[PDB]
Amino acid sequence: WRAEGTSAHLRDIFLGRCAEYRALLSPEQRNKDCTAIWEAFKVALDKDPCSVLPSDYDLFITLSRHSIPRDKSLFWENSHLLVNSFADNTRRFMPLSDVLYGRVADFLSWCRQKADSGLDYQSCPTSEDCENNPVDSFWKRASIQYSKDSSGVIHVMLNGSEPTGAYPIKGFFADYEIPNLQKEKITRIEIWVMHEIGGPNVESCGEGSMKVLEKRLKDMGFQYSCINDYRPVKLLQCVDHSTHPDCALK
Amino acid sequence: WRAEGTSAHLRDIFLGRCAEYRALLSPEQRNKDCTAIWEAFKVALDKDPCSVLPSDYDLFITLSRHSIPRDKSLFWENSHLLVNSFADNTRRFMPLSDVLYGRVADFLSWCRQKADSGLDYQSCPTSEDCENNPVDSFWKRASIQYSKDSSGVIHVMLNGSEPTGAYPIKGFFADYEIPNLQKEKITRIEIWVMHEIGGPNVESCGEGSMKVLEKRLKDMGFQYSCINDYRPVKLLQCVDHSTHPDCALK
Ligand SMILES: *[C@@H]1O[C@H](CO)[C@@H](O[C@@H]2O[C@H](CO)[C@@H](O)[C@H](O)[C@H]2NC(C)=O)[C@H](O)[C@H]1NC(C)=O
Ligand SMILES: *[C@@H]1O[C@H](CO)[C@@H](O[C@@H]2O[C@H](CO)[C@@H](O)[C@H](O)[C@H]2NC(C)=O)[C@H](O)[C@H]1NC(C)=O
Ligand SMILES: NC(=O)c1ccc[n+]([C@@H]2O[C@H](COP(=O)(O)O)[C@@H](O)[C@H]2O)c1
Ligand SMILES: NC(=O)c1ccc[n+]([C@@H]2O[C@H](COP(=O)(O)O)[C@@H](O)[C@H]2O)c1
Structure with a gap:
């Protein structure tokens, strides 16, 4: 894999950023369950690092989407x-990085190991290694949602x-x-x-x-x-x- | 208590900020245990909200201190x-907010309930309610260290x-x-x-x-x-x- 490896302490960063961002939402939209948002997100980390599609993050978007x-x-x-x-x-x-679903992943990197269940901290596939990697598919889904709204x-x-x-x-x-x-x-x-x-x-x-x-x-x-x-x-x-x-x- | 209550999801935010700051530390001092740092912080937290002194955060500082x-x-x-x-x-x-021990608390608020052992999310004392409150004692201790270093x-x-x-x-x-x-x-x-x-x-x-x-x-x-x-x-x-x-x- 020719791209940056999984971000260390991915979960803590993710949950932390999600918690801080909530305070920015209005009370009317402040009802976001960060732990559930992370669970929906980590589904891509249970898959082959080259078999993740944008639609895989649909649930994640449904749980974090806000106007x-x-x-x-x-x-x-x-x-x-x-x-x-x-x-x-x-x-x-x-910008997208300042919207809930973009904020939690901004600048981060992630992917499951090729043959094991653990996360790969060594490296992650680039679009050149394979088209359906976790990071690219994430941003495609998120940028699509950001444009539509x-x-x-x-x-x-x-x-x-x-x-x-x-x-x-x-x-x-x-x-x-x-x-x-x-x-x-x-x-x-x-x-x-x-x-x-x-x-x-x-x-x-x-x-x-x-x-x-x-x-x-x-x-x-x-x-x-x-x-x-x-x-x-x-x-x-x-x-x-x-x-x-x-x-x-x- | 005249000041705002403890920040919601204080732990997730704390650990989140701590995890992210590490990446900013040189490999030499990057050896930081965020969970332990959190435990040191709780030591001062789990006390009477009007009995927390700057020294109560000595341990917190020791585990988070860096040049x-x-x-x-x-x-x-x-x-x-x-x-x-x-x-x-x-x-x-x-600045202090860009130093590990300051970064994790920036803008946050915290205090334990007057009686019960739970955190008080309703309100926290100001210098007026009582001098030795958790937040003011924290910043006094942190200011002292930032200044000495x-x-x-x-x-x-x-x-x-x-x-x-x-x-x-x-x-x-x-x-x-x-x-x-x-x-x-x-x-x-x-x-x-x-x-x-x-x-x-x-x-x-x-x-x-x-x-x-x-x-x-x-x-x-x-x-x-x-x-x-x-x-x-x-x-x-x-x-x-x-x-x-x-x-x-x-
Ligand atoms: C706009 O593009 C320029 C050119 O690519 C960026 O500047 C380069 O940044 C890289 C990495 O920081 C350096 O290796 C180059 O020496 C820089 N080139 C020049 C001409 O400055 C610049 O960072 C980009 N601006 C923004 C805001 O991203
Ligand atoms: C510098 O101090 C001034 C004066 O306290 C601050 O300006 C006031 O800010 C409040 C809160 O936003 C406003 O309601 C007032 O209208 C402002 N007064 C004046 C005269 O401008 C200012 O925010 C401080 N600057 C910084 C960078 O914190
Ligand atoms: N970290 C991010 O905020 C991030 C990453 C990838 C794509 N995007 C979206 O795609 C567009 C271009 O970004 P790229 O640098 O990936 O080409 C932007 O307008 C943005 O909304 C955002
Ligand atoms: N959140 C903070 O960064 C924070 C809070 C209280 C004191 N301080 C320190 O004390 C000095 C005065 O600022 P304050 O008015 O907030 O107390 C500063 O130089 C600063 O380093 C910093």
Whole structure:
């Protein structure tokens, strides 16, 4: 297996994050049984590390699903850490990692051992080793649910300094989220193309892969919009480059 | 009891945070037993809610204690959430909430019932109800240790928009941290007096209570410096006021 091995103390982390997230839910949706949510999740750990399907996590989703506030959904590609810091524990936006079912697994890794019943802490299959691995199937199911329950203004953060372009045509965003957006519940889609401070400007709005994305969205009938270096996020990037010209204050 | 009751699922949260913090420790001190640390914590917990002293957490500290990087300590008053966001989970600085023994209790609340042996989820005493309550004794003990283990350049974030002044002469910093700083391993102390965007300039470096802080540190023999609205933190504050003139970019 060519991917990271199972996260140590997976269960405690999972249960801990689930318990803390509950406090964020409103009393009306605060009724979530974390132990049951974990039991539904661990079903993938009883299977062959190459035989886990997205549907296997259906129960898990049913037990953790909760609504997402309108205009608060934030999708992304190649900017995991920046999205989490910007979203700031749901205060600014609510990306998948800030939704219950995404929160419990964010950055974690897991899979059962090939021939044994125990968890494999050595490594886990990548999409290259096999398509139906536990992690990939998990995110496909979770991202599908996140897209379906999103509404209002849809925000997307992309990396304009990524060597392969801002929009990867084969990513989760392209294959599992865009196709599941409910047009009737969406006002418009707003893209944020962020560049590293001083970093390379590989692609900006309307260039390269960004043209492919815009064309797909408009063809699908969505009202579209793109912003290079959305100021609020730029300010956050600047926290680490305060003495750089890009970050000088008036 | 005037303070909020013990946090729900206190144990799951505690162990969850503990498990996650380990990954952040260098292999050298990563040898931590979260369950044992929890048991040490309970020792102070299973006592009369108005009879818990700082020393009751000695064991807890011993099992969770670890070194703090030179020049990475960050003390503060009246800016808890801003300090946590700036510190960014130990990436920039390591405030008390980003040290193992502080991380597991951050924002939480706890106390045993006045009579029965169960935790009191209804309420917990404040300093007013009784001085020796579980939470205040915990933070006194933790502050003392954090302070004794800090070295190099000491940083302090103060809120210059606080009505009563930037430096509380009766807060944890003045009463439990400054007295426990080891001058032998400290090079200098640097203060950052932060003001709310647009917010009031109640006090700035060299004014009011700040004059008290400076004189106390200098009387103790420390090299001292103060900075108004330290740029990196100012930028972070700006993320939420991108269109305010204080936040306009060059
Ligand atoms: C946006 O993409 C850039 C380019 O891939 C990322 O920066 C690279 O990060 C890797 C790993 O941290 C380094 O090995 C490279 O040296 C970096 N390259 C450059 C040009 O900076 C950057 O981390 C991405 N931004 C976000 C928020 O994920
Ligand atoms: C710095 O102190 C100020 C003053 O106490 C804090 O601002 C107040 O925050 C409360 C609670 O959110 C508001 O109801 C008041 O309207 C604010 N007053 C003013 C004058 O702004 C501020 O939150 C503190 N800063 C930090 C980072 O904690
Ligand atoms: N840890 C996560 O939060 C996580 C992981 C994989 C996919 N996703 C979803 O897929 C999209 C792209 O993420 P990838 O980096 O996996 O391509 C995002 O918009 C997100 O909602 C989120
Ligand atoms: N949750 C916390 O991180 C926490 C709580 C109480 C005291 N403290 C320590 O005491 C000092 C003053 O802050 P407080 O006003 O919260 O007591 C800080 O420098 C800090 O290190 C930290």
